[PDB]
Design an enzyme around this catalytic site. Structure first.
Site, mmCIF file in Angstrom:
data_model
loop_
_atom_site.group_PDB
_atom_site.id
_atom_site.type_symbol
_atom_site.label_atom_id
_atom_site.label_comp_id
_atom_site.label_asym_id
_atom_site.label_seq_id
_atom_site.Cartn_x
_atom_site.Cartn_y
_atom_site.Cartn_z
ATOM 1 N N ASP A 73 -37.778 -76.255 -8.818
ATOM 2 C CA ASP A 73 -38.347 -77.364 -8.501
ATOM 3 C C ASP A 73 -38.322 -78.326 -9.554
ATOM 4 O O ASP A 73 -38.945 -79.411 -9.073
ATOM 5 C CB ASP A 73 -39.049 -77.355 -7.123
ATOM 6 C CG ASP A 73 -40.556 -76.293 -7.753
ATOM 7 O OD1 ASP A 73 -40.993 -76.300 -8.886
ATOM 8 O OD2 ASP A 73 -41.196 -75.755 -6.715
ATOM 9 N N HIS B 141 -44.629 -76.628 -5.452
ATOM 10 C CA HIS B 141 -45.071 -76.884 -6.394
ATOM 11 C C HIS B 141 -46.681 -77.775 -6.301
ATOM 12 O O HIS B 141 -46.976 -78.398 -6.949
ATOM 13 C CB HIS B 141 -44.001 -77.778 -7.438
ATOM 14 C CG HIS B 141 -44.480 -77.507 -8.941
ATOM 15 N ND1 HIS B 141 -43.070 -76.549 -9.993
ATOM 16 C CD2 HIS B 141 -45.286 -77.999 -9.931
ATOM 17 C CE1 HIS B 141 -43.705 -76.874 -10.933
ATOM 18 N NE2 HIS B 141 -45.162 -77.378 -11.095
ATOM 19 N N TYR C 247 -39.137 -72.575 -17.256
ATOM 20 C CA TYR C 247 -38.364 -73.717 -17.409
ATOM 21 C C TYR C 247 -36.903 -73.158 -17.907
ATOM 22 O O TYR C 247 -36.613 -72.637 -19.652
ATOM 23 C CB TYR C 247 -38.597 -74.477 -17.644
ATOM 24 C CG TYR C 247 -40.469 -74.827 -16.913
ATOM 25 C CD1 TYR C 247 -39.420 -74.839 -15.707
ATOM 26 C CD2 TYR C 247 -41.830 -75.383 -16.857
ATOM 27 C CE1 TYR C 247 -40.738 -75.854 -15.112
ATOM 28 C CE2 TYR C 247 -42.409 -75.903 -16.549
ATOM 29 C CZ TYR C 247 -42.273 -76.048 -15.167
ATOM 30 O OH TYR C 247 -43.088 -76.302 -13.934
HETATM 31 C C1 LIG Z 1 -52.746 -77.754 -13.714
HETATM 32 C C2 LIG Z 1 -51.050 -76.579 -13.316
HETATM 33 C C3 LIG Z 1 -49.737 -76.870 -14.525
HETATM 34 C C4 LIG Z 1 -48.514 -75.864 -13.413
HETATM 35 N N1 LIG Z 1 -48.223 -75.477 -14.233
HETATM 36 C C5 LIG Z 1 -46.779 -74.961 -13.474
HETATM 37 C C6 LIG Z 1 -45.742 -74.483 -14.100
HETATM 38 O O1 LIG Z 1 -45.966 -74.317 -15.602
HETATM 39 N N2 LIG Z 1 -44.838 -73.616 -13.533
HETATM 40 C C7 LIG Z 1 -44.714 -73.709 -12.779
HETATM 41 O O2 LIG Z 1 -43.938 -72.560 -11.917
HETATM 42 N N3 LIG Z 1 -45.692 -73.990 -11.694
HETATM 43 C C8 LIG Z 1 -46.738 -74.643 -12.433
HETATM 44 N N4 LIG Z 1 -47.738 -75.204 -11.165
HETATM 45 C C9 LIG Z 1 -47.265 -75.034 -9.829
HETATM 46 C C10 LIG Z 1 -47.729 -73.373 -9.412
HETATM 47 O O3 LIG Z 1 -47.596 -72.364 -9.789
HETATM 48 C C11 LIG Z 1 -48.565 -73.379 -8.305
HETATM 49 O O4 LIG Z 1 -47.267 -73.612 -7.159
HETATM 50 C C12 LIG Z 1 -48.745 -74.171 -7.420
HETATM 51 O O5 LIG Z 1 -50.218 -74.509 -8.389
HETATM 52 C C13 LIG Z 1 -49.868 -73.345 -5.817
HETATM 53 O O6 LIG Z 1 -50.707 -74.064 -5.136
HETATM 54 P P1 LIG Z 1 -52.299 -74.328 -5.641
HETATM 55 O O7 LIG Z 1 -53.063 -74.578 -7.091
HETATM 56 O O8 LIG Z 1 -52.375 -74.827 -4.078
HETATM 57 O O9 LIG Z 1 -52.864 -72.822 -5.841
HETATM 58 C C14 LIG Z 1 -48.928 -75.573 -11.143
HETATM 59 C C15 LIG Z 1 -50.030 -76.267 -11.328
HETATM 60 C C16 LIG Z 1 -50.580 -76.866 -11.680
HETATM 61 C C17 LIG Z 1 -52.305 -76.732 -10.558
HETATM 62 O O1 LIG Z 2 -46.697 -79.142 -12.385
HETATM 63 C C1 LIG Z 2 -47.447 -78.758 -13.907
HETATM 64 O O2 LIG Z 2 -47.823 -79.658 -14.049
HETATM 65 C C2 LIG Z 2 -45.886 -77.899 -14.862
HETATM 66 O O3 LIG Z 2 -45.725 -77.491 -13.568
HETATM 67 C C3 LIG Z 2 -46.359 -78.408 -15.691
HETATM 68 C C4 LIG Z 2 -46.719 -78.757 -16.928
HETATM 69 C C5 LIG Z 2 -45.335 -79.799 -18.157
HETATM 70 C C6 LIG Z 2 -44.022 -79.830 -18.022
HETATM 71 O O4 LIG Z 2 -43.703 -80.578 -19.170
HETATM 72 C C7 LIG Z 2 -43.400 -79.647 -16.809
HETATM 73 C C8 LIG Z 2 -44.223 -79.152 -15.902
#
Ligand SMILES: Cc1cc2nc3c(=O)[nH]c(=O)nc-3n(C[C@H](O)[C@H](O)[C@H](O)COP(=O)(O)O)c2cc1C
Ligand SMILES: O=C(O)[C@@H](O)c1ccc(O)cc1
Ligand SMILES: Cc1cc2nc3c(=O)[nH]c(=O)nc-3n(C[C@H](O)[C@H](O)[C@H](O)COP(=O)(O)O)c2cc1C
Ligand SMILES: Cc1cc2nc3c(=O)[nH]c(=O)nc-3n(C[C@H](O)[C@H](O)[C@H](O)COP(=O)(O)O)c2cc1C
Ligand SMILES: Cc1cc2nc3c(=O)[nH]c(=O)nc-3n(C[C@H](O)[C@H](O)[C@H](O)COP(=O)(O)O)c2cc1C
Ligand SMILES: O=C(O)[C@@H](O)c1ccc(O)cc1
Ligand SMILES: O=C(O)[C@@H](O)c1ccc(O)cc1
Ligand SMILES: O=C(O)[C@@H](O)c1ccc(O)cc1
Lengths: 355, 355, 355, 355
Positions: free
Chosen positions: A154, A250, A126
């Protein structure tokens, strides 16, 4: 466990409600979250028959490394929310399964600790308000042996997570952003407000194409842009020197109403025409879903929520079992479809159906 | 309140059944009412990434005035049905939010009183059997500082509102058409009959293109034709000198089976090719819906029922909170979609999905 | 009654179960029965605005007679099943409403009695095993003042009505085919067997194009072929000298899986290119449905089941009320759509939507 | 019994849960199982009218034999699971009805015993790890009077049957693969494991185009490749000397997410352009479904599960009743659609509808 759905049931049982909601939820009305599933369910594969299957292999080469499956663990922040071993448990299981693991900027264990597990990990970036902190993270990741930088593009800020807002969700005291001093913002409890969302608005600077170039100039590692949906953004990613993109909304957590990645994937694969790796995520829940993604042209998929279900249910062993199940389902689907390799799976045709 | 849906729940609790039904209902089987929602739910946005968001603005210029959002409050008759302060409460909140407010021919507070609130309001016209009364209303509106005439063209008479018929709905004694002496027709109670519908048949003359020309010749204000759905009617509106149109099926309250405006919008925008402003309404329930409308080419949207939910729930403060929520959702959606301005949002592409 | 649906509820209350099922049911899985409704629900009208509505008329000229609406009562056998006055009640109401009434070959009151009611009726023909009986019926109908012969061409035998089979449905002793001596076949009670279906197989000869020519040569009246769905059959109907066709799947009672007439109508209208009248039936349940049919190109519609609901609910007065309601709904829909005549309604455009 | 659905209800009542599940179930999420039904339900037939039906015949000539219907009994392993008489009961009923019966490699009564029933049967081949056993089976089948070899090409191994896994399904001691000594693998009980699936992985060798050629060289009988879905595999089947193909996803039991055969059928029929017979299966549940398949171009259909429902419900007599019902439904549908022969039915047009 005979399907990934078994793991979700297991995880709902054990996790606190607000943590399950932080995991499961999406932004707004959760239209994009649901559409990620709908989109996969509408795709049908046209399998081939009577091909040689004497040495079916699910392996791929990606970002200079052989992976056991066309799959990596998606970046998911704050894995200690789900199990005390958090990211270490998941990374160990991924290493043992030969699957790349994506270490997060917002990991609850430091990136160096997770990298020390081994398994040739990736690092998700990030962009932060102080640029230098983000570029320092990139250099830390590279120094620690991470093999790709997955720049998430995104999240200029966090989406409106209504479950988190209604729950007044905040990180527990014992879960922190271990790569930083991230302050107290994500821990303060305010009614009707997601603490993690206001932390993000305070901490994150919106990334731009200039940010991408700054990262590309700062590392020899492949830079992978995660969160691309527009065809022209995929083309520009290639022009910008990206080694890959992840076609993704996402997990329905950012723009509510964003098209599913799976719906853009074929058009994007055609437009980049081999110029970078094209991954996809969102709603992958089986080896058959992996096959669908591959048939639509993906180099590999990411899997997010199911890995956390497995972690919550049974820690490292849970993640191991999930990855073994997915590996078996991918092998099964490939062979039943007449594909001795992932490349052959990419040459499969598909047909849209109904519901 | 974290979504507009929170306000509908609040309004159902407080309003009398027959008044909630007058507000919520549509004509016939309510096919068009439901289709307005279905139509928006099927649209997905293809967001852009990595663009400069250092000065995201949701403002537009329309009919010679800057508006804070690409949104106005739709004309809704008889607002005292929902709260004692009626139109004054809504107009004050709209003024404070920088959103245009549409004063109705059938306002329950006089147009001059509502205009005195300030906020550069618009005036909605119904054509009456005595033409001179309608042209006098236009001149009153202009004298009072209204900035556009929104001529509603889809009500030669009122649609068949079966909820109102079944309820035997009539205006309470304390709610009247304050711009007139409108007679007793809308107050008489007859079983199986909507009193407002037979009042309309008695009072309204069907408008024609000649009526439009009479209005255009009687005022210097932009004339906006509300209720256009056919592409050729949009083209003719431009030829007739309209400054705008609202692509609309009147919230599903007029012809049951009329196409949703959102389904005609793109074709209409292409056909008028910048010759007038093209607004849309029907089923806008979030900032993401605003973004969808913008991406399909709308200059702005109108919002009807949700404004009344907010009014019913909490008066002026309720409307303020609704507009603040919508403003935040629009900013959020725009930025997540890579749009620093409404113009950029209009250049977004969309993709139809399922359910 | 404010909608046709009010009448179905009324009829279910009063009729014996097996008679309601004989009326409501279709063949097989009732796929075509349901599809007739689905097909109409997917059509949306693109209304026109601002047209002269000073003399809206719902009248048409068809088969040499002015009709008050673009609608006729469909042929429905054995109307004494639903009310003691049967066909006389329906014919009287149709006469009074200015709507053509179709007298059936299997009427439970003789065709001459029903014709004596007046109202310039039509006569529906089934081809019988002895040709001469069918040609004698045509001559009887013509002698009695019927103005068109509606030759039903989609019943070489009766479809598989599983409700009737499960109910062991048979005609009550007091209901007979009054135009004949039709024997005892339709009255015998056999378990798992529809008595009317085996009566049909015994009594009916399949009609062919030769049968059509025999009828055309035997009468000066317009011959209307009811049950056409294939475009080439519509073309051949014109070549064969038909004055009209009814695009119809027999209310889903014949081939289960037959396309709805409404889905073939536009293509058929284009192919015949004014060479005969093109009517449609199946699932018309409102004036808005009439408008949809008209916009797709129909000259007129037939309405079947709702007329019987009205008859069952309240006899002649019930049918009168149904026709008055339909007349009001047709006028309402036409005017709201900018149509001062049925011809203008035929020039409306439509758009398919979802669910 | 008035529909096939009556038989499923009857079979669920009598069969043990795990056996009903072995019969009913599919692989994975059962997406392909459900899609086989959805796909048929979306097809509507455009019937023809007024054609000569004085000698309607449902007969076809296929693989050198007249069949009473455009239908054969699909290969279903281990029929003694459903009734003590197993394959003998079904074969006798099929013989009496003039319908081909497909004897399975995994029959629970020996192929020679079933062939001795008469009725000019077909023989389904699975390719086994020792090739010679499979080629010996082909020669046994031919020596016993089987008239076609139906080589199943979509089972390199068995799909993931989650019902069977959850039930820990295994064959009862009294049901065996009577054409072999098949070992004990399919009888061992292991938790979370389908015994038949691990038996298949142990016993079956994946077939290839070389296997097809080995079979074609070993017999004078027509070789029919069952499980073709890709157009190019259909073309290659013709080039390889196949006398037919069955367009099939194995009843949704193999690749979960495989397109329904009915969705590929028209394209396949066009591509082979009369070079071999093109059969289809999956979800055929009525004569109307047979008609749909025929209209899409099929030479004939296979029917699987319903035959087993009938067997379970009432043995040989049950199967007889099912085939009589299907015969009546096929005759009914054909005639109502204006088809005096199956060839005429193949010339019918179709139209896709919704739900
Ligand atoms: C609880 C949670 C936290 C996530 N944190 C991040 C993150 O820190 N960075 C990021 O690029 N994507 C994050 N994602 C998105 C995931 O990388 C991914 O795009 C998404 O979970 C894929 O879909 P799926 O959960 O249906 O397999 C997060 C998703 C979830 C559910
Ligand atoms: O989707 C999310 O939660 C993850 O990408 C995220 C978590 C904490 C945050 O501060 C920013 C993005
Ligand atoms: C209770 C009510 C009263 C209305 N009164 C008017 C009116 O007087 N003039 C007019 O042009 N539209 C009127 N409308 C239509 C709205 O301006 C608008 O087209 C519709 O409400 C937009 O759909 P929405 O309610 O889904 O946001 C009314 C709508 C409602 C619900
Ligand atoms: C109970 C019943 C009896 C019918 N009898 C006849 C008949 O004798 N001749 C005929 O041509 N159609 C007959 N029909 C078909 C109707 O004329 C018409 O095609 C169908 O009812 C139109 O669909 P609707 O009922 O959805 O309005 C009958 C329909 C019903 C429901
Ligand atoms: C219990 C069961 C066993 C089967 N065994 C075989 C088999 O041994 N060989 C084969 O080619 N197909 C087999 N099939 C697949 C059928 O031949 C056929 O493709 C499928 O059942 C057709 O779909 P339907 O059941 O929807 O009619 C089996 C199907 C079922 C349900
Ligand atoms: O949709 C409505 O209710 C509004 O447009 C209206 C209200 C009262 C009326 O007399 C005519 C129209
Ligand atoms: O659909 C019907 O029931 C009608 O068309 C009919 C009634 C009786 C009959 O014998 C033949 C057809
Ligand atoms: O679908 C099936 O069950 C059938 O094709 C089969 C049965 C047993 C087996 O070992 C292999 C295939």
């Amino acid at each position: 466990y005979v399907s990934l759905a078994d793991l979700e049931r297991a995880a709902r049982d054990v996790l606190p409600g607000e943590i399950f909601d932080f995991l499961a939820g999406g932004s707004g009305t959760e239209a994009s979250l649901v559409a990620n599933r709908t989109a996969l369910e509408r795709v049908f594969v046209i399998p081939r028959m009577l091909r040689d299957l004497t040495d079916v292999t699910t392996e791929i080469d990606i970002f200079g490394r052989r992976a056991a499956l066309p799959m990596a663990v998606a970046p998911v922040a704050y894995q200690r929310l789900f199990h005390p071993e958090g990211e270490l448990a998941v990374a160990r299981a991924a290493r043992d399964a030969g699957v790349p693991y994506t270490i997060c900027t917002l990991s609850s264990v430091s990136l160096e600790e997770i990298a020390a597990v081994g398994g040739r990990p990736w690092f998700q970036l990030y962009w932060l308000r102080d640029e230098k902190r983000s570029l320092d993270l990139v250099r830390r990741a590279e120094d620690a042996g991470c093999e790709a930088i997955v720049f998430t593009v995104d999240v200029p800020w966090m989406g409106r997570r209504l479950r988190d807002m209604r729950n007044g969700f905040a990180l527990p005291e014992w879960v922190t952003a271990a790569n930083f001093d991230a302050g107290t913002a994500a821990h303060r409890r305010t009614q009707g407000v997601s603490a993690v969302a206001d932390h993000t608005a305070r901490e994150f600077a919106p990334a731009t194409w200039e940010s991408v170039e700054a990262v590309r100039a700062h590392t020899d590692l492949p830079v992978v842009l995660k969160g691309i949906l527009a065809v022209e953004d995929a083309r520009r990613a290639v022009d910008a020197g990206a080694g890959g993109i992840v076609v993704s909304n996402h997990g329905g957590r950012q723009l509510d109403g964003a098209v599913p990645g799976i719906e853009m994937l074929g058009e994007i694969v055609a437009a980049v025409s081999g110029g970078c790796e094209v991954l996809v995520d969102g709603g992958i829940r089986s080896g058959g879903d992996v096959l669908k993604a591959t048939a639509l042209g993906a180099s590999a998929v990411l899997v997010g929520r199911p890995v956390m279900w497995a972690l919550a249910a049974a820690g490292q062993d849970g993640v191991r079992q999930l990855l073994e199940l997915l590996a078996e389902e991918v092998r099964d689907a490939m062979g039943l479809a007449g594909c001795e390799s992932v490349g052959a799976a990419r040459r499969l045709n598909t047909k849209l159906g109904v519901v």
